[PDB]
Structures are given as C-alpha cells and as structure tokens.
Write a protein that binds this ligand. Structure first.
Ligand code: NI
Ligand code: NI
Ligand code: NI
Ligand code: NI
Ligand code: NI
Ligand code: NI
Ligand code: NI
Ligand code: NI
Lengths: 208, 209, 207, 209
C-alpha cells in the first residue's frame, strides 16, 4: 500500500507591517489506503487554488480524514475549519499557550479555529503514523509545539515537510553555508538523505 | 448628538489568479450616542491593523453594537465573525443567493460567516438609520444586494461609503470622464454635494467641485 | 504562416494604499514568421515567472523584435527596459502627456522607462499589423492612448487583448449585466465573436 | 552637529513562488550637516510611500548625497536608480559576484541597477563614517557583501540597521530564544546596548533589556 503525495499549494508571504498579513503555507495532500491526509491546510488566501486542486482530485473537504499541523500559526491552520470529518494532529504543548493573549482580535480568531477541531490527537514527537509512512519529529526551533514530518512516498521518495524551522530555500541555504541554526542543522543531519525538502513558504527543493 | 467617523483600514487588493486572494475592504467605524458601528468589517488580512486601531480606541470587538454591509463578499464581511454582540444590517435580497454554489470550499466559508450573524436587520434601500445620520441606498451595480451609505458626520462632513460600485479612485475618475457606469454616475448626481468619497479598495477622496 | 500565442503571465493586483504598489499586467507572447512579439511586457514583480517562461521557450529578451503597449502605465510597460532590440508600438497621443508631472519619484521612473524606447512606431488605431494578424483598436476608456488588440491565432483562435478597459472578469461581467461602460459594451459588440478574452489583471475567459 | 533619523518605509514581503516577487526593504533616511543619506533605498513597489515622504520632507531625489547598501539584493537597491547625485557605499566583495549568472532576466536587471552607480565607495567593514556617527560592520551571514550599520542619532538614540541577517522580529526572537545563528547572536552581543533595532522587512523594535 503506497502513499502518494501532491503539493496542492506552494506557500509564500504577503506582509506589510501594520496593514496586511496574508502569509500562506504550503499545503500537502497524501493518499494512503482509505486515508486522505492534509499537512498544513493553509490560509484563507489560498481558497481559489484549493478549490481548483480539490476539483482536479474529485474530492470535497468532507472526504479529508486526517489533518496534521507543523504548528499552530494561522497561516498554516486556518483552513482546518473546512474539514469537519477529520482527525487533527498537533503537538501536545500547544495546549500550554494562551491564544487569547495573542491580541483581542487575533486571539479570537485562533480561538475560533482551534475550537472547531472536534477530534484531536496530541503528539509528543517520534511517533511513526499511517503504517510507518509518516515519521513525526519534534522540532521546537520556531514555536514550542513545532513538528516536522518525514514521509515515505511512492511518487516523490523520501520527503521532509520542514515547517517553519526553514521557511524557504534561503533559510536552508544559510544552514548549508554554516551560519544558520545549529539545532536545525543537526536535525537535518539526523534525518539524512532525502529526495525532497518541502518548505512552508517556498517551492520545494531536491537537496544537493 | 454628533456622529464621529474613523477610517480604521483603507482597503486594497491582493490578487494573483489561481494562487492568492487577499482582497481587503476599507473598514469604517462610527460612534453615535451609545452605538459603536462598523461598516464593512473587512478581511482577515487586516487583523494587525484592526488590532492597533481597536487598541487606540480603547474598545474590544464585544463593544461593537451594529455592523452594516455594502454587500456579501468575503473581503468585506469576513471579520463579522468577531462581533458577537452586534446587530447586522444587509439588503434582503442576499437571502436569494445560494452561497454554497460559490464552490465547495469558498461556499463553505461564506456559509460559516453568514451563519454567525444571530441578529439581522434586512434592508430594502432608502432607510434612514441612527437618528437620520445614515442614509441607505440600494445600488445593485456590482451585486444584487449591494448598498451604499451616506453619513452625516461631525468631523468629516457628508461622507459617501460607495462600496464596490466604485472600488477605487480610478473607477470614480472613469465616471467623471464620461465612460463609466451610467447608473453609478446617475447615483452620484442624485447624492449631490458631499465632502468625502470612501472607496472600499483605495484611500478616500474629496470630490471635484 | 501561422501566429502562435502563449500567455507568459496572467496579471493581477497588489495594492495597499500608501504602502505597496505591485500591480502587474498579463504578458502575451506571439510568434509569427521571424517575429517574436510581446504585448504588455509587464512589471518588475513578474521577473521570476518571465525568467521561467523565457527559459522554457529557449529565448532571450534580446530575441524580442516587437513590443506593443495597450497603454503607458508602469505595471504594463516597466519590463520594456529588457528588450533593447525591439521596435515599440504605442498610440501617438502618449506624447501629449507630461509623465514628469506624475510625481517627482514616479514621474522619474516613467521617464526613464519611456526614454529607453529607441525605435518607436506611433499608432492611431485601426491599423492591421503583422500580415493582418493583429488588428489595433483605439479604446480610450481608461487612458487617452489606450489600445486593444485583436489577434488571429492558430492555437487559440480569435483573441482579444482588452487592456484596462476591462481589467478582470468581474468588469466584463458588469458589462454583460448591463451596468458597465456603454462605450466598452459597444466596442465588444463591434468586435463580435471571439474565442478568448485576455484581461490584463485576471486569467482569460472564453466569452 | 546632530544626526536625525527618519524611517521612510518599514519593509515587508510579497512573494508567491513562480508568480510574484515584490519584496521591499525598509528605507532609512538620515540628515547630518549638509548630507542627506539613504540606507537601503528599497524597491519599486514602495514608490507611492517614498513619493509621500519626500514630499513631506520637502526634498527631491536630486538632493540625496549618499546611499549605503546593507547588501546587493534587488529589494534593497532598486530605487538607487533615482539618486543621480549620490555617492554609493557597498562592501568591496560585491565585485566578486557574477550578477549575470542570476538568470537572463534577473541578471539583466541587477546589471542595469549596478551600472547606474557612477560614484562608489568600497567598504571593508569597521569604517566609521559621517564624523563617526555611522559605524560599519561586515556581517556576512546572508550574503558575502552584507553590512550592518550602527547609528548614533539625536532623535532615536543608538540604532542598529541589521539588514537581512535578521529580516524581521521573529528572526530576532529566534536568536534571543537560543536557536538562531550563533554568528548573529555574537554580533548583537558585540554591539551591546542599543535603543532600536531596524529590520529590513518588519517594523523596528526596542530590544529586550
Ligand atoms: Ni510559523
Ligand atoms: Ni509559516
Ligand atoms: Ni464586491
Ligand atoms: Ni470589494
Ligand atoms: Ni492602466
Ligand atoms: Ni493595468
Ligand atoms: Ni537579502
Ligand atoms: Ni531583504
């Protein structure tokens, strides 16, 4: 039973201080057996791209069975409100944050999104999920609850969903050049040879 | 009892076909007597600006008493989900649209936003609200439920919230130059002399003499 | 001799009053005989998409022979600076505008772009260009120099490059619904049956 | 003779892979004696904001005497084409990069911008400029030519223009939390107590005690 990967959205940034916040994460779709899995469902601003991709795939949001989060930042999780039948997976320490302290307005939005998750599995890191096709790593070098996911796929080989420990190619290159996070560098060394790096705010890359 | 206007957000556009939709409306705040009124609460992408402005004003979303919509487009209405204590005002023909036919995904979002409105006043056009400080016009030259609002303010004089019949200054200039919508031009002629045009996707403008 | 169309970039809008102006036009590429033609070269913010498309096509900006402008707005014309070997086509009345009056900063950028056009063909409207494959219409319902182009293509049929008289699909729908520009509506009636509408700030549409 | 700081633009990001690149840096303006100084003139997309700030200041691009670059990335340097009378300052090792190899189109744009700089001062790091009001640091943890600038200002105290070694507040917080660049962290330790951090793609921040 093979796991197939599709990148529904490659993420990016839209940010003007005090005026515009439309960051949007990469959205990863996986099919394995009877599971239809999303990692980082993304932000509202990706709605038209997702509409198009769901239509190509012949599926509805109602068919998504499992949704995993690298972390609890709105630009990665907002679209979670679409998936009423999914089980949601997230690192347990997210429960130690007071999201209502994020600002009157912003906190209310986090709270409404988070409250919509009716079935939640809390992770610790090191789990291997979906018949060992998905390995979970606790990678708290961005947010305390941050996770990265290593995927054993048929069509794309061994794929690392980095999350925001490496938001884009430049951040990855900074690690290679030796002046980035020592923790992230050590983590990448631990993971070892992979076929594809899937960043949250850039197009993916085959490591050199 | 004077009505005071503050423009919390001047709107704009962020659109890349097939990739990015982050249009965001102008957000207008009005204080009159014990009412705290918003016209077009805007889009999620304005959340940091709104945070700042609410903080300057010393208010919370819970203090908003009334929210009016030019029309039912997400970039104007999304933030309506923040105002749990407000009465919502919208043109009655919005009920004749099937929002779930807007796309599986996009329809679901519209439906969830619209369902959050627990107290709704249905407008027809021509209403004079808030002790005659707000005049409602049915201006369906964009969407069937579209409304424009004329405000009698103390601090900004006579202010027309156009909505999307004139999204920005260039669209207004096209009317003035004679090659824009005949219906919108007629409407502006009807309204007559005003002090300020507040567009949904641009900075406001003092009109030509 | 057939004319082939490729849409290199579908345009859009990025605009925050007082803070951000990154509007970018649709960029149309046409090959006909030995001509490599661009209509509305676009804005700086399309640079990565253009790099990718030029690389797919196996061409350089040096190989572009002809560049036509719907009108002289920066989000349509900026990338003209890349095409040093091209002949530029533009409506003659652009010369009657004082671009340095656009603002000290913005005027300077217009002036620098416009000064880079070394070979210019001035159009009036109604011209048929490239062995009658491109018909030029003067459509001054946005800017006095504004042009629209009707293209007789092999791969996409009859294609109207609207320019900013209809920036996107919504503006076209407003005309269909009867409350948009009467002049644009009459223009579209005059053009008649076409296979594709190519807007400057949206994906194209089969009418 | 005091040096006055004005932040003309706070920078940001606009990036959609394969479709849109409109990153734009913070733009810093300094007045000292007869000098009108820009650090990182920014990107084309800031043109309306710059227009408005230049108008407020009562100056033209022709009045800018000095322009310094944190580094040679288009979103920081593009607007350099506006300043015909300026001396440009940049780390010498930029000359070792082949900008034509950045891609046919992108390389062309870099080359045209860089060619417009008629008077250039090549920096090495550790220079003290403008009567010692500006200290230059070689901070190559982003690009080989990358510089940061420490400013002694009258109106904002001691200000660090970080450049892209810390693009925004989150990158700075990562350093404070202990999992960011060791080199950047050691650099901030070396700089010591300052009043303001000016990031290239975010609003500035008063540092942590
Ligand atoms: Ni994050
Ligand atoms: Ni992120
Ligand atoms: Ni609308
Ligand atoms: Ni709108
Ligand atoms: Ni235009
Ligand atoms: Ni345009
Ligand atoms: Ni950089
Ligand atoms: Ni930068």
């Amino acid at each position: 039973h093979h796991m197939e990967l599709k990148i529904l959205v490659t993420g990016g940034n839209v940010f003007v201080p005090g005026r515009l916040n439309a960051h949007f994460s990469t959205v990863v779709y996986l099919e394995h057996k009877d599971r239809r899995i999303i990692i980082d469902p993304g932000n509202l601003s990706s709605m038209d791209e997702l509409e198009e991709k769901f239509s190509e795939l012949g599926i509805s949001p109602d068919d998504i069975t499992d949704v995993l989060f690298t972390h609890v930042h709105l630009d990665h999780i907002f679209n979670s409100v679409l998936f009423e039948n999914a089980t949601f997976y997230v690192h347990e320490v997210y429960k130690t944050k007071n999201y209502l302290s994020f600002g009157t307005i912003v906190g209310r939005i986090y709270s409404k999104v988070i409250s919509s998750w009716k079935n939640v599995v809390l992770l610790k890191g090191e789990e291997s999920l979906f018949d060992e096709k998905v390995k979970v790593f606790h990678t708290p070098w961005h947010a305390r609850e941050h996770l990265s996911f290593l995927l054993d796929t048929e069509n794309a080989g061994r794929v690392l969903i980095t999350g925001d420990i490496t938001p884009n190619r430049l951040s990855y290159y900074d690690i290679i050049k030796g002046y980035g996070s020592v923790q992230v560098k050590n983590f990448l060394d631990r993971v070892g040879r992979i076929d594809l790096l899937v960043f949250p705010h850039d197009a993916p890359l085959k490591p050199e």
